[PDB]
Design a protein around this ligand. Structure first.
Ligand code: FES
Length: 97
């Protein structure tokens, strides 16, 4: 399945694109010409942190966020598979200190 993902940046800018259910959101975003922050690309840091506003993802390949943070809606975009249409706020690394 191919879902629709909308990213909302720190300045209010928006990006909307197709995201295959078998591709990481970060990779789908790059295919769509969006430059997002990232570093390890392995789910082991907080650089690519984003926050789900709606929709759901599978970020089980990640291991940096604890259940609390995940409950609040934080997602590691570099290891997140979309499971439905999503609206995610990017550049949220600052929230994870
Ligand atoms: S870039 Fe490090 S967890 Fe995503």
């Amino acid at each position: 399945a191919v879902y629709k993902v909308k990213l909302v940046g720190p300045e209010g800018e928006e990006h909307e694109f197709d995201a295959p259910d078998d591709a990481y959101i970060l990779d789908a975003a790059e295919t769509a010409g969006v430059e997002l922050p990232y570093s390890c690309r392995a789910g082991a840091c907080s650089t690519c942190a984003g926050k789900i506003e709606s929709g759901s993802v599978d970020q089980s390949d990640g291991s940096f966020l604890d259940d609390g943070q995940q409950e609040e809606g934080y997602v590691l975009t570099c290891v997140s598979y979309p499971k439905s249409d999503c609206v995610i706020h990017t550049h949220k690394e600052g929230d994870l200190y």
